[PDB]
């Protein structure tokens, strides 16, 4: 009767429609992409100094966004199969971290690499710090999904892990963006007028825009069914395929485009 | 008719009077207590030196006492949740390292932390090691789980993997000990009679107390109703309470004390 | 009706025979052995110099090979116990990473370890990166598991997932080899004819060796139920039983012997 965690719920048609379908997608070919762009950037990658052969191999921090893309990919790659074979992936089947037929489960994987990754680009201290409450966080929107999809007797479940995953959230926040305020003001007192200054600007606003456009993955959470169901199932998906693509992908051809061009004026200073 | 490992146990009635509910609230409470604790002395910490601004962001190993009781808050939120909720949390709906609706599989995250956390404090060899050994004594623990609330025909299977884990538990201890014993004796005739002999003293006898509290756990497992039946469910619940404020809370206020007093007449040795 | 991931499946009576739970005994006891053996070897090892009293306690990557063996040495403890209990183990219960009830689930915990450990002996660059991806593909075996043994309407699910495995373990082979190939091309150039040469030719067959054996594992999925199905279920079982002997323990010795005779003649080369 409730299928949430189910595998009887797995063998169900899909409830998704084309648009949710086609999303899912195109959020597959861009993760796709980025993993084959971010996998040759690792390979010719000289380092700052351009004179240590497979730098990426021996840093391999360098490679947190490529493993973002990859995790992510196959994550899409999940939903892609289950699309056109026609059968449910909603919260259903196995419970697999790293897999998104539970949402958030993915993200339990992709998104403490890609914390640790944003505060390693300002050499910012509480890196793994970060990526420990990021991994609750998602535990928390997990939780939530088996409260919200299930017996409606246990609902209000969904709204305690939701207040829990949000408080430690707005925590994390506004410790993290005290900590790459901290490490931009450090750098810009040294960077003087140097011509580093303006890189340095950039990598700023950059990991800030990126860190910010996180706020909009529990938003979404608020305005789908979960919360006030202003977008049904098929739209919410459509929002998470765009997220999906604005986080990692996008983020992952910024970072690369950044070390192309300013990793040298800074590898000095950081 | 079975419901251990199924969503359908998940949706019965709590099995839990008030002392088990009321036990719940209180580790709940202390462990929320010490993460905030652990949390100010993390971010105010400058290290043995008292220079170093933000030295628990840098060295991360600072934050592993801090991690053990946010995770152990985490999972016992779960618990307070699904009590006050009414539906039944003991061994039913997702397994999910690092949450305790399985038994076991909360300190499955939190107690390899603890055991690495243990012997950083006396830069023991086998940090590393001893986690791996850990993990695998938890997952003998969730397993003799399975077996002890399934079908009486395998209930055996539950005795196997007690003993597998104790043979190991025993094992590991018998070769940590060892090391315990050996890094003191190193350290004491280093330190003759300068001061740090006195401090190396308290930190010997501590990391020996702590580790030796976690004989409790295979010991309430032996009373409990898993073997001789002593105590009934809920008594087992008080138990495992107890057991855990004084293996992640104490150790908690009783590490960031040492730190307090002691760091700088050990750092110059350790 | 469909078994797979439940505890229904879990309660069911073995499938398996007499050759099967032979070849689960024999591997146990193997495991178990080299278990033993490279704890052994873990507690005396002084290093390449021999003048460092618990080495392998400092340089804890030397204990890869002994955490693999003693992880995969759990896995059929638990297949033994599934046995002499008469239970069917196959694809049934908890999912638990670095548990063998599911096929595959188990490698997802000691395979990553496994391909750490190869591409360290040569210090070869991208040894988290080739980690990270042998996780995917040992997960897209797991996944084409379900849709194996699920619904027939999702069979061709296990295909596309075998096949995604397949592309990405041709992709990290196609870079790794390309990896060692050139760090044995580095330090053969480096060698000389200083008798060092001799070990270090020694190393790259036997890492060549051991790497290309892992071809057995997608091999037999090919010739077994889940592709052509010209062997059973209960060679199969024998067949990943001889592949785990050859992979861990086999390597497990191999490795410890190189240590034993070559490790000095390297360390100051490598
Ligand atoms: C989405 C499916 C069909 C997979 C296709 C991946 C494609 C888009 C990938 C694979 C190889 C990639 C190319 C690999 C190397 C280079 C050289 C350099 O100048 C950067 C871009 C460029 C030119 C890449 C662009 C994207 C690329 C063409
Ligand atoms: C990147 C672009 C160009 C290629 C797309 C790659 C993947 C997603 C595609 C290519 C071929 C596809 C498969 C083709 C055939 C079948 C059989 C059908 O009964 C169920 C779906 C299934 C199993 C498809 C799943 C998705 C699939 C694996
Ligand atoms: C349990 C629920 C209600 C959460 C409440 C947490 C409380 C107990 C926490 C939050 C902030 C904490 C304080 C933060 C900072 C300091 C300064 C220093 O002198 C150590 C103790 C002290 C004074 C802490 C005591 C505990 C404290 C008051
Ligand atoms: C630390 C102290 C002071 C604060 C306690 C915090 C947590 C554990 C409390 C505060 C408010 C509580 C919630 C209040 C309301 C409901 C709705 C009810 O139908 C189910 C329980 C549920 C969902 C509670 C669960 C536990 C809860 C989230
Ligand atoms: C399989 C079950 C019954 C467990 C038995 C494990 C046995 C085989 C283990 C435990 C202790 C081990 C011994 C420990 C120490 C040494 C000394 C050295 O010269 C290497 C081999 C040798 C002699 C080992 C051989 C294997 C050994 C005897
Ligand atoms: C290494 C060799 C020498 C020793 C073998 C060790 C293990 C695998 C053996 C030793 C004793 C065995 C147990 C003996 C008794 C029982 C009770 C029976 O109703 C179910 C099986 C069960 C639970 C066995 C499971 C496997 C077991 C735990
Ligand atoms: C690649 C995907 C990314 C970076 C996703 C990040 C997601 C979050 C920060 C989600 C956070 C949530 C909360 C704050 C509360 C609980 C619900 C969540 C999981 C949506
Ligand atoms: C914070 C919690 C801690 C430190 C818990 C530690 C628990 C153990 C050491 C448990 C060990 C067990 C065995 C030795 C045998 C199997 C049963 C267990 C899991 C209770
Ligand atoms: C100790 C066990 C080892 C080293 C096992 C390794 C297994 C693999 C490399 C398996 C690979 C597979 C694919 C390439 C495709 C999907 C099916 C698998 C999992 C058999
Ligand atoms: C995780 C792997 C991602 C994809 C790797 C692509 C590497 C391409 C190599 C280019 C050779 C010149
Ligand atoms: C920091 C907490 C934010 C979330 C607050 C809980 C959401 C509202 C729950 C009540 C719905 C009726
Ligand atoms: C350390 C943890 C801090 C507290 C964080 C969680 C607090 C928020 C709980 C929200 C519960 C909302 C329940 C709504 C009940 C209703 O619908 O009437
Ligand atoms: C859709 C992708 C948006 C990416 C945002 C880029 C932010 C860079 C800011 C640099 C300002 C100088
Ligand atoms: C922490 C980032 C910001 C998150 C913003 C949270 C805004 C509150 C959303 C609560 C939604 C759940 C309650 C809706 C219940 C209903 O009206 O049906
Ligand atoms: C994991 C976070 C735990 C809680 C953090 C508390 C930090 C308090 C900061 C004090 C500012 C002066
Ligand atoms: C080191 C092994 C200790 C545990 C021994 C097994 C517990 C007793 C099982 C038999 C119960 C009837
Ligand atoms: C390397 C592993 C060492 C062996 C560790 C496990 C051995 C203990 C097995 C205990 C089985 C007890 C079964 C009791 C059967 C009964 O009740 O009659
Ligand atoms: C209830 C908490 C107990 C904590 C035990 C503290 C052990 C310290 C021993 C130091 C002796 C000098
Ligand atoms: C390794 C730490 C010490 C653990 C002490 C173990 C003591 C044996 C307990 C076995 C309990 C299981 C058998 C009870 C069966 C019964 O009588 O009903
Ligand atoms: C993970 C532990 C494996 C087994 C350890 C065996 C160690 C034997 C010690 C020999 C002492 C001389
Ligand atoms: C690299 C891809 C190899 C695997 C190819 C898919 C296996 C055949 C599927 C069709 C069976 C009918
Ligand atoms: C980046 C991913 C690359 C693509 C790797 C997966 C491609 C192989 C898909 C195989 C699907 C085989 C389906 C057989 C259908 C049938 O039986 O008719
Ligand atoms: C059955 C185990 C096989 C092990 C293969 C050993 C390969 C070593 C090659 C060295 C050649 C000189
Ligand atoms: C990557 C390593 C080599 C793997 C070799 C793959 C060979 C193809 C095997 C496909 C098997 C699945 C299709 C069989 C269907 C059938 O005929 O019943």
């Known amino acids: 009767m409730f299928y949430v965690g ?15 379908i086609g999303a899912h997608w195109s959020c597959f070919i861009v993760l ?10 690792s390979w010719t ?16 921090e360098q490679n947190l966004a490529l493993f973002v893309n990859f995790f992510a990919m196959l994550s899409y ?17 196995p419970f697999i971290i790293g897999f998104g037929n539970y949402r958030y489960a993915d993200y339990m ?16 201290p509480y890196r793994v710090s970060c990526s420990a409450i990021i991994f609750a966080i998602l535990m928390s929107g997990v ?8 017996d409606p007797r246990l609902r ?17 926040y506004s410790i993290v963006m005290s900590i790459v305020a901290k490490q931009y003001s450090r750098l810009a007192q040294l960077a003087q007028d140097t011509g580093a200054e303006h890189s340095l600007h950039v990598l700023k606003f950059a990991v800030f825009t990126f860190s910010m456009l996180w706020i909009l993955f529990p938003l979404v959470w608020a305005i789908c ?21 604005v986080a990692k992908s996008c983020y992952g051809f910024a970072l690369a485009r950044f070390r192309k061009t300013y990793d040298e004026e800074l590898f000095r200073l950081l």
């Open 225 to 245: 069914p979960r919360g006030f169901g202003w977008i049904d199932d098929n739209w919410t998906e459509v929002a998470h395929c765009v997220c999906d693509i």
């Open 6 to 20: 189910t595998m009887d719920g797995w063998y169900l048609d899909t409830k998704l429609n084309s648009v949710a």
């Open 156 to 172: 209000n479940g969904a709204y305690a892990w939701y207040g829990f995953g949000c408080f430690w959230f707005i925590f994390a």
């Open 45 to 60: 990658s000289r380092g700052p100094s351009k004179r240590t052969s497979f730098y990426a191999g021996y840093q391999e």
């Open 109 to 124: 994987l992709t998104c403490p690499m890609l914390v640790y990754d944003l505060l390693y680009q300002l050499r910012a």
């Open 143 to 150: 939780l939530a999904e088996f409260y919200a999809e299930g």
């Open 77 to 93: 790659f999940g939903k892609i199969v289950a699309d056109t074979l026609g059968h449910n992936f909603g919260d259903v089947g």
């Open 32 to 41: 796709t992409i980025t993993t084959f762009y971010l996998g040759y950037e």
